[PDB]
Design a protein around this ligand. Structure first.
Ligand SMILES: Nc1ncnc2c1ncn2[C@@H]1O[C@H](COP(=O)(O)OP(=O)(O)OP(=O)(O)O)[C@@H](O)[C@H]1O
Ligand SMILES: Nc1ncnc2c1ncn2[C@@H]1O[C@H](COP(=O)(O)OP(=O)(O)OP(=O)(O)O)[C@@H](O)[C@H]1O
Ligand SMILES: Nc1ncnc2c1ncn2[C@@H]1O[C@H](COP(=O)(O)OP(=O)(O)O)[C@@H](O)[C@H]1O
Ligand SMILES: [Mg+2]
Ligand SMILES: [Mg+2]
Lengths: 240, 384, 880, 394
């Protein structure tokens, strides 16, 4: 046997009394497969969008451009923005769009909710918070995404936005969350420099609802003559 | 290996040559008398034969375990992985100096004696907060101030570079520095620059994560932080936005507002307690200085307090000059309009305006920025 | 990188030299015009030492090297003007024009004749133009010409004048640390031919600067601590007249010429004493000089101030005879005693309390009585630990107790006999001898007329039994230890020359006679050598004869670097190896302090181990014991290397020396205190070590805490007190462990016993300290010879304090400020001293071992200005 | 001139140093091995005399005994409980019930007693070292120094006067005063002077994760103290560990209250500690609990107040005596210019005057430096001062 073949984290047979090595076994274990399988994020792409033209324009020019075209920002020279906030009523289509751009720019889209099942995968106890950076750098092109329903997330994002503002060496890392009710978020987060962009998602109107119906009715056997425009009209702007 | 540090002549003087000859001759005779005996009394290889015997004493399978108590007389109490512990002996070739309670040990398989020590490759939390690369550009990138920088240098940098003025004077340098003022006027920026130029290790932690979710944890964290800080070397610690502990409440905090008091007492003792400090500096900053405990700020725990006021028209001019260096801008624009854009615009509004206008011109794949661009950019960033 | 356009200097001064061979002939005007323009341009453009990479210095040798080669030597018609522009300028680039092997080649440009007064255009330059050329020439050419043929051509006639004028120019531009470069032209030049160079530098520096003397003094003495014999003699003898001719310091001569006392000539020291007696302006200088001249750094010299004016002028030495000792007793009574006045109780030794949860120990208790009772520690009815043991058993114990009664009242003359005669009526072979030794000890150092032939001679005259006769020649010699009167020498000679059956008495007679005379009278060494020749023929026993006889000869010819006396003494004892056991004693004994590492290398070259088949066991033992020498004052470089050597060789891979006596080397090394000692010695000492002769370990324990200066490390020894209960039984270590515990705090002060005072001077204390280390060989002497020697072995402690008044009326007590030891070598500006200003005390108690104290309030202290530990503190206030 | 020669000499000697360093043998960076010259003894003989003769000898805890014929109960950590006897070489007297013992691995019979456990943190809480501050660095409070030294130190070094006359000295002392006054420094002075042990504890070290841990820590703290002969315990920042009992609604501070009760109980009721002295300090003592401040626990109530006037001049003398300053300035005026100020302010005034001198170019400071320093650290910073809110004691 040669030492080089003896990789870390490998299964090996082993004789009984002398306890000496004897052969090799293929199977190996990893953390990320277990954490991602716990999470179950829904991969998608641009195809399913209905009525979100301008929003996708600016989200792509703030996220998709400064990875494939860093030198294009070198030319004008303004720094690369890193903080985008999406806000609007619930159930209007934030998470799908963030995953859409993460897929189109090929970044490992990870989300965090501060739960405890996945905590052990990150570390033994997680006394502090930023240990995820020590796990994110091995997969650098990544997007952190969070969500708020009905204040811990805000302090977490504040710690992060403070972190990668000059002290973090690695590039190619962006953070984003989506929440409703801008008027209630913290004051320290409204300073002109901390966050970079804010994007509104209004509840869809008639044309948007019609397009959404057409998109979601592609896996169903229709009937000759439905006039689903009437169906779109009957819905008085509920949501997406 | 530092044979003789008396090399202070450092020139063509006879002293250096004579000392070098004396060292050379000493080592010559020592080499002969520790070499010829081995030529004439090998008795064995002593290069593999003695190592052969040692490898014989430690049997081919040997286990790992944890040490728990030591009696100096070459045998101690060691634990096994299962849980039952023993009273084994200590061999003599085990370097009975680096054995500290808790270090892993290698135990013989039959009689469980102490055989070896395994290096404890752990380094768990050191790497989370210890900054390892230069932050950015030095004092040339900050416009204004000057009065403040003088003080920061006196209390942080100057002692390390020139430890000759103070000791000649008989003064110990002042200890702590707190930086306070309205939001977004460059407290963190000056911190980054100081980290840039300096030579000592820089440790950073934000005040907000001093709080935790269990009892008796905050004090543990602070003890650990200052321990690792004094573990390395002359170092600099940065505690940022302290006021966050004393103004907000979070449900995950199992204790109430009394555990925060406990944490504060611990931190407050770390600076000037029953034990000699060593060589560590402290820098902290906040923008609400009228809420924290005045017992925390008394001289002896922090001496210099430096206040950061709003920018003035001369400094505003300098700031617009700095932040548009590598910008390919048209002469059509007049900065004098933007200087009077707001009654009391702060420093961060400057960089906000510049970057936003750049973005909005680059929207159309263009290189030059016009005036109406700023006319809409300032409105976008200042009003919402 | 553009070239041309600006190519004026790199073209024209490159084209004129290229055609210079063609311009040499058929063109007298142009050759000289261009030569003058080149000389003036090179002189002016090279005036400042800021453009080292000159546009002309480094750009002429690219192609003009062949022109310089074929132009200067190949001219054959040198004129009176072209030579002025050629030799003055072309020699400037000759230091760097060629490759590195150039020092043996400078002759072909400059050595024909030194151009005029080249310093005229080379005086404003620091380290570029010509002084470097002079140093390069003196590096090889002058050395090779004048090695054994100094008297030769121009290589010595004008070279000395040029070197002298350049050396004067060194202290001409800034006179800063570049003045320390003067030795690079004076000391470096003609090392062994230093006499004329030093005389020239003196006659040039006599009128140059008086204040620029002390710096050069210290610089030269920094290299004068260690050198070859000729180098040391010449350098010291030439430096001696410096502080008197140029400056008028005239005050450190008495104290700093102890190094110049023996090594150069004792007659020269007598001449310095005479010239010091001549210069007696007032009283501060003379009194400060004579304060340390019988109690610190010499003796046997109180015979020079007995002229016709011995009233107050020449009577001052009398106050140092006994009056200063009386003041010492009074200051021990007042200063230290008032702060702390123990009763010899040894309460500190009784530390069994706090911790808690045979007649051999009576020896340790008697030592507890003796040790703590220093500085006026007279015991009235407190001597029960010796009184009760004095008449029950242990004759050697009673003797030791009576002797320790003397150290209880140490360096006293008022009532030593008063205390002694109250108990002298004992009619014991051991109490009486100890009483007489105590009497001699009490007045020892006083050098008074207590008992030249009255007290101890009454015991000596009855030499018909040992001890009562043996302990009667050593004590009287101890009383006259500081005096070299040959009357007592002749009186005690019959003790050794009797060849009587009292072997112990004859040995201690050798010790006694050696410890009085160190100069003349080779007849005493002759008598000792005849005694050993007529005695050691039919014997091969232990070192009882050998541990006493050769030591006196070695001390009587100790610390002399001529080595001629060593050669003669070694050659006179040529005989069989057992008889020649003392061949290597006098060889090394004359090597107390000097730089002679060649002697060290030849010491161990002859005999390293030889497998150590019990054939030279004591021989190799004493060889290693004498290897300890040259390290007490090794200028801080020998000690570390020596301790490393002893650690690497003996104890690690050896035969017997390391595991038996390697522990004495630390004792002979130092006692300042280094953590590598208290960590290395217990590393081999904590272990029981039953494999080796563990009695050696016992010695190591009894000789571990020999470091003085009471500190807070005693807890270590108390842990050993916990380890000393079961193992290391009382039968051979009961008193030894306690003596180790007490060694650090023998008295509460009075601990300067390190044989290094002032800067690095010995102070002639080896003759008194050495006997302890010589007698502590290892075995069979801890019960018969140790108690008889280990008590009063050391009596040359240098007081306890270094700051004192000694004013006319003693009005001032103390006004000073201490800092750390001096650690400065070079600085081109104001020189330093010490930077521990934090301490500001005005007490005359502890002064600090490795500390240097300064004054304040701007007193200028014009008494001593250098050192001496007894500053007069003269008052001057000419500065409002 | 000959820099190359001397430099090459230095290089050759360094190379020869490392050469002979390899030659003797220390190389091959170790995984737990000593240099060969050190274990030479234990290469051939110690192996053969430490492998066959000595046994493993498991460690266990004994439960009880029973009468007339020694029969013992042994409890081991993960195996069963056994009934065993002794071996011949050990006396039957010293096997008092309930302590660690070592028993052999075949017949399971008692071989040797062992010392008991003591927790790992409480061991490190001892001092094992003594700081540098002495008694001359507390100018201005001679009264308190005499009063404290008379209870914490005098009886230990002269334990005959009190026993002869028939008194037992007190056992406690409390130190309180506004922040910056100087109590912790007095504790350091005491630690420097003493001889017996000295265990330092800070109140925040006595809050633990789980329930009932603090009480255990206090028990073994006092037990470890009892093991030794006699020495001091210094408690710092008490007011974090027990104030008063005010329970209402949901439980609040209950656990900390149990800790306080255990600490109280350790000093009173049923055969008290005996030869142990405590020593406490605080900043706002109004919140201390009445049952803790009762005498029998806190006999003396030393109090530290703001310096008067000899205090101020004397603090100046102490903190400025290591200065390079002008020889003709008077500090009494400086004392007058600052009415109510602490020792801290005087220290900072000395520092800032030195800094003003080093600011421009000078080498020695003068009166104007001191006047400017007082004008700035006293009057300009006075809107961040504690003392207007720590003299009402909250
Ligand atoms: N005088 C100045 N010169 C240059 N840039 C400045 C100046 N004042 C402010 N700025 C800009 O404003 C930005 C905000 O400053 P910084 O992030 O350090 O805030 P801060 O003072 O720590 O406050 P906060 O607690 O609100 O974050 C800096 O990144 C810098 O670009
Ligand atoms: N009497 C005094 N003599 C000398 N210095 C003093 C004196 N009183 C106070 N000081 C100085 O003031 C400071 C006192 O702070 P210290 O660390 O002793 O805390 P404290 O007053 O005991 O309490 P706290 O920790 O609650 O502030 C020290 O720096 C000390 O130098
Ligand atoms: N405009 C839309 N187009 C397609 N699907 C939508 C749209 N709006 C909402 N949805 C559906 O609603 C779900 C929630 O999406 P989203 O609004 O991003 O998360 P949240 O409701 O938490 O903000 C998605 O699974 C998506 O299928
Ligand atoms: Mg900030
Ligand atoms: Mg305190």
């Amino acid at each position: 046997i040669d030492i080089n073949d003896v990789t870390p984290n490998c299964r090996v047979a082993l004789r009984n009394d002398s306890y000496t090595l004897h052969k090799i076994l293929p199977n190996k274990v990893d953390p990320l497969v277990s954490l991602m399988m716990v999470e179950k994020v829904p991969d998608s792409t641009y195809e399913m969008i209905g009525g979100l033209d301008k929003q996708i324009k600016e989200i792509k020019e703030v996220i998709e451009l400064p990875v494939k075209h860093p030198e294009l920002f070198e030319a004008l020279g303004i720094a690369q923005p890193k903080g985008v906030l999406l806000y609007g009523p619930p159930g209007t289509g934030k998470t799908l769009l963030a995953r859409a751009v993460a897929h189109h720019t090929d970044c490992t889209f990870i989300r965090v909710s501060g739960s405890e099942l996945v905590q052990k995968f990150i570390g033994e106890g997680a006394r502090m918070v930023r240990e995820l950076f020590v796990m994110a750098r091995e997969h650098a092109p990544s997007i952190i995404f969070m969500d708020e329903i009905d204040s811990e997330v805000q302090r977490t994002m504040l710690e992060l936005l403070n972190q990668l503002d000059g002290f973090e060496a690695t590039k190619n890392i962006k953070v984003i969350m989506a929440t409703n009710r801008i008027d209630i978020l913290d004051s320290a987060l409204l300073r002109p420099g901390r966050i970079d962009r804010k994007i509104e998602f209004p509840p869809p109107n008639e044309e948007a609802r019609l397009d959404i119906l057409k998109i979601h009715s592609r896996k169903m056997n229709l009937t000759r003559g439905i006039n689903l425009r009437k169906i779109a009209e009957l819905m008085p702007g509920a949501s997406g | 290996a530092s044979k003789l540090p008396l090399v202070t002549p450092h020139t063509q003087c006879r002293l250096k040559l004579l000392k070098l000859e004396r060292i050379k001759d000493y080592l010559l005779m020592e080499e002969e008398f520790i070499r010829n005996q081995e030529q004439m009394k090998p008795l064995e290889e002593k290069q593999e034969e003695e190592r052969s015997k040692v490898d014989d004493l430690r049997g081919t399978p040997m286990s790992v375990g944890t040490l728990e108590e030591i009696i100096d007389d070459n045998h101690a109490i060691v634990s096994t992985s299962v849980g039952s512990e023993h009273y084994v002996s200590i061999l003599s070739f085990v370097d009975k100096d680096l054995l500290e309670p808790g270090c892993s040990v290698l135990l013989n398989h039959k009689v469980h004696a102490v055989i070896g020590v395994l290096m404890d490759d752990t380094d768990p939390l050191v790497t989370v907060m210890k900054v390892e690369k230069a932050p950015q550009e030095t004092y040339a990138d900050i416009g204004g101030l000057d009065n403040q920088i003088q003080e920061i240098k006196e209390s942080v940098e100057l002692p390390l570079t020139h430890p000759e003025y103070y000791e000649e004077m008989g003064i110990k340098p002042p200890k702590g520095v707190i930086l306070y003022g309205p939001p977004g006027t460059g407290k963190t920026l000056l911190a980054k620059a100081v980290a840039n130029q300096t030579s000592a290790t820089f440790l950073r932690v934000v005040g907000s994560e001093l709080i935790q979710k269990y009892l008796g944890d905050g004090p543990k964290l602070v003890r650990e932080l200052f321990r690792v800080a004094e573990e390395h070397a002359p170092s600099i610690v940065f505690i940022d936005e302290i006021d966050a502990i004393g103004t907000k409440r979070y449900d995950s905090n199992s204790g109430g507002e009394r555990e925060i008091q406990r944490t504060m007492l611990e931190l407050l003792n770390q600076l000037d307690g029953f034990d000699s400090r060593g060589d560590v500096k402290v820098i902290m900053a906040t923008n609400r200085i009228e809420t924290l405990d005045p017992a925390l700020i008394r001289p002896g725990r922090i001496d210099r307090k430096i206040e950061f006021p709003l920018p003035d028209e001369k400094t505003k001019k300098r700031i617009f000059q700095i932040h548009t260096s590598r910008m390919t801008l048209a002469d059509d624009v007049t900065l004098d309009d933007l200087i009077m854009a707001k009654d009391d615009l702060s420093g961060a509004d400057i960089k906000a305006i510049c970057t936003e206008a750049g973005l909005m011109a680059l929207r159309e794949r263009r290189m030059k920025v016009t005036n109406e661009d700023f006319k809409k950019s300032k409105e976008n960033v200042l009003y919402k | 990188m553009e070239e041309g356009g600006r190519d004026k200097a790199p073209v024209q001064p490159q084209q004129s030299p290229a055609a210079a061979p063609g311009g040499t002939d058929e063109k007298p005007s142009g050759k000289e015009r261009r030569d003058a323009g080149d000389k003036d341009k090179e002189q002016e453009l090279s005036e400042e030492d800021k453009q080292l990479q000159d546009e002309l210095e480094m750009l002429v040798e690219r192609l003009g090297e062949k022109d310089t080669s074929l132009y200067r030597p190949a001219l054959e018609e040198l004129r009176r003007q072209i030579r002025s522009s050629t030799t003055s300028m072309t020699s400037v680039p000759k230091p760097l024009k060629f490759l590195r092997p150039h020092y043996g080649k400078l002759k072909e440009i400059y050595e024909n004749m030194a151009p005029g007064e080249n310093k005229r255009f080379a005086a404003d330059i620091i380290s570029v133009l010509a002084m470097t050329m002079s140093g390069e020439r003196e590096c090889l050419k002058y050395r090779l010409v004048g090695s054994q043929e100094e008297l030769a051509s121009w290589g010595h006639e004008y070279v000395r004048h040029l070197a002298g004028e350049v050396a004067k120019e060194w202290q001409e531009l800034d006179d800063a640390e570049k003045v320390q470069r003067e030795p690079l032209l004076t000391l470096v030049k003609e090392i062994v031919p230093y006499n004329m160079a030093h005389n020239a530098e003196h006659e040039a520096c006599d009128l140059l600067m008086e204040i620029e003397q002390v710096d050069m003094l210290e610089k030269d003495i920094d290299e004068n601590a260690y050198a070859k014999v000729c180098l040391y003699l010449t350098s010291c003898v030439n430096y001696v007249p410096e502080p008197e001719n140029s400056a008028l310091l005239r005050c450190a001569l008495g104290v700093f010429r102890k190094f110049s006392r023996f090594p150069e000539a004792l007659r020269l020291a007598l001449m310095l004493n005479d010239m010091e007696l001549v210069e007696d302006i007032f009283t501060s200088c003379k009194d400060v000089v004579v304060q340390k001249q019988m109690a610190f750094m010499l003796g046997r010299h109180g015979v020079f101030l007995e002229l016709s004016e011995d009233v107050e002028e020449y009577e001052d030495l009398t106050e140092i005879m006994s009056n200063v000792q009386l003041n010492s007793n009074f200051l021990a009574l007042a200063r230290e005693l008032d702060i702390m006045e123990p009763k010899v109780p040894d309460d500190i030794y009784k530390t069994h309390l706090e911790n808690n949860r045979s007649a051999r120990m009576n020896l340790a208790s008697s030592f507890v009585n003796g040790f703590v009772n220093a500085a006026f520690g007279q015991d009235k009815l407190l001597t029960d630990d010796g009184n009760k043991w004095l008449y029950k058993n242990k004759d050697h114990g009673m003797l030791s107790a009576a002797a320790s009664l003397g150290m209880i009242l140490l360096w006293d003359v008022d009532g030593g006999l008063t205390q002694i005669d109250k108990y002298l009526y004992s009619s014991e072979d051991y109490i009486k001898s100890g009483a007489l030794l105590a009497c001699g000890i009490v007045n020892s150092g006083v050098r008074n007329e207590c008992d030249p032939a009255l007290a101890l001679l009454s015991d000596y005259v009855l030499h018909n039994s040992n001890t009562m006769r043996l302990g009667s020649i050593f004590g009287l010699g101890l009383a006259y230890a500081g005096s070299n009167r040959e009357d007592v020498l002749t009186l005690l000679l019959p003790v050794m020359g009797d060849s009587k059956s009292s072997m112990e008495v004859a040995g201690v007679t050798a010790l006694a006679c050696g410890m009085i005379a160190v100069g003349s009278c080779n007849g005493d060494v002759t008598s000792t050598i005849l005694q050993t020749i007529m005695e050691k023929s039919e014997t091969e026993l232990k070192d009882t004869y050998a541990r006493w006889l050769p030591l006196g000869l070695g001390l009587n010819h100790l610390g002399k670097g001529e080595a001629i006396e060593a050669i003669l003494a070694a050659l006179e004892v040529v005989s069989e190896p057992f008889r020649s056991f003392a061949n290597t004693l006098v060889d090394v004994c004359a090597y107390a302090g000097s730089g002679n590492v060649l002697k060290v290398q030849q010491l161990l070259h002859i005999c390293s181990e030889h497998f150590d088949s019990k054939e030279k066991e004591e021989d190799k033992d004493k060889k290693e014991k004498k290897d300890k020498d040259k390290k007490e004052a090794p200028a801080d470089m020998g000690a570390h290397q020596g301790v490393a050597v002893l650690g690497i060789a003996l104890i690690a891979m050896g035969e017997e020396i390391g595991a038996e006596m390697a522990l004495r080397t630390f004792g002979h090394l130092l006692r300042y205190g280094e953590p590598t000692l208290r960590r290395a010695v217990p590393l081999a000492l904590a272990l029981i070590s039953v494999s080796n002769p563990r009695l050696n370990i016992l010695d190591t324990l009894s000789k571990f805490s020999h470091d003085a200066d009471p500190e807070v490390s005693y807890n270590s020894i108390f842990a050993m007190g916990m380890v000393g209960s079961g193992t290391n039984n009382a039968r051979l270590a009961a008193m030894l462990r306690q003596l180790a515990q007490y060694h650090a705090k023998d008295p509460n002060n009075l601990f300067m016993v390190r044989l290094a005072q002032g800067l690095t001077h010995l102070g002639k204390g080896t003759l008194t300290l050495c006997p302890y280390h010589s007698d502590r060989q290892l075995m069979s002497q801890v019960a018969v010879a140790g108690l008889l020697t280990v008590l009063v072995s050391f009596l040359d402690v240098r007081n306890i304090i270094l700051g004192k008044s000694h004013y006319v009326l003693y009005g001032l007590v103390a006004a000073m400020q201490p800092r750390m030891l001096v650690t400065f070598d070079e600085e081109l500006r104001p020189l330093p001293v010490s930077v521990r200003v934090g301490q500001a005390v005005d007490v005359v108690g502890q002064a600090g071992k490795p500390k240097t104290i300064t004054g304040f309030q701007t007193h200028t202290t014009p008494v001593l200005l250098a050192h001496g530990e007894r500053a007069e503190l003269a008052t001057e206030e000419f500065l409002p | 001139t000959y820099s190359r020669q001397i430099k090459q000499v230095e290089d050759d000697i360094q190379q020869l140093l490392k050469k002979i360093n390899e030659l003797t043998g220390i190389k091959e960076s170790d995984t737990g091995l000593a240099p060969p010259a050190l274990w030479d003894l234990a290469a051939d003989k110690q192996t053969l005399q430490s492998e066959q003769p000595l046994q493993v000898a498991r460690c266990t805890k004994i439960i009880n005994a029973d009468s007339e014929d020694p029969k013992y109960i042994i409890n081991v950590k993960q195996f069963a409980k056994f009934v065993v006897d002794l071996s011949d070489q050990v006396a039957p007297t010293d096997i008092e019930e309930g302590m660690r013992v070592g028993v052999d691995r075949n017949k399971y019979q008692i071989h040797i007693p062992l010392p008991p456990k003591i927790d790992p943190t409480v061991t490190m809480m001892q001092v094992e070292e003594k700081p540098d501050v002495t008694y001359s660095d507390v100018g201005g409070c001679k009264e308190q120094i005499e009063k404290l030294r008379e209870v914490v130190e005098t009886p230990l070094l002269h334990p005959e006067r009190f026993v002869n006359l028939g008194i037992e000295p007190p056992k406690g002392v409390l130190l309180f005063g506004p922040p910056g006054t100087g109590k912790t420094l007095c504790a350091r002075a005491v630690a420097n002077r003493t001889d017996a042990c000295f265990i330092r504890v800070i109140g925040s070290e006595l809050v633990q994760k789980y329930v009932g841990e603090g009480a255990r820590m206090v028990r073994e703290l006092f037990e470890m103290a009892r093991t030794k002969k006699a020495c001091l315990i210094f408690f710092d920042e008490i007011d974090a560990i027990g104030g008063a009992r005010f329970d209402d609604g949901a439980g609040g501070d209950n656990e900390v209250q149990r800790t306080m009760l255990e600490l109280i109980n350790q000093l009173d009721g049923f055969d008290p500690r005996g030869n142990i002295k405590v020593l406490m300090a605080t900043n706002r003592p109004d919140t201390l609990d009445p049952a803790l401040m009762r005498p029998g626990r806190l006999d003396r109530k030393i109090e530290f107040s703001l310096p008067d006037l000899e205090g101020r001049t004397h603090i100046f003398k102490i903190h400025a005596r290591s200065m390079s300053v002008e020889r003709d300035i008077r500090f009494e005026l400086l004392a007058r210019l600052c009415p109510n100020s602490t020792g801290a302010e005087i220290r900072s005034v000395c520092t800032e005057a030195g800094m003003f001198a080093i600011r421009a170019r000078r080498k020695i400071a003068t009166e104007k430096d001191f006047l400017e320093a007082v004008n700035k650290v006293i009057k300009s910073y006075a809107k961040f001062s504690a003392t207007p809110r720590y003299m009402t004691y909250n």
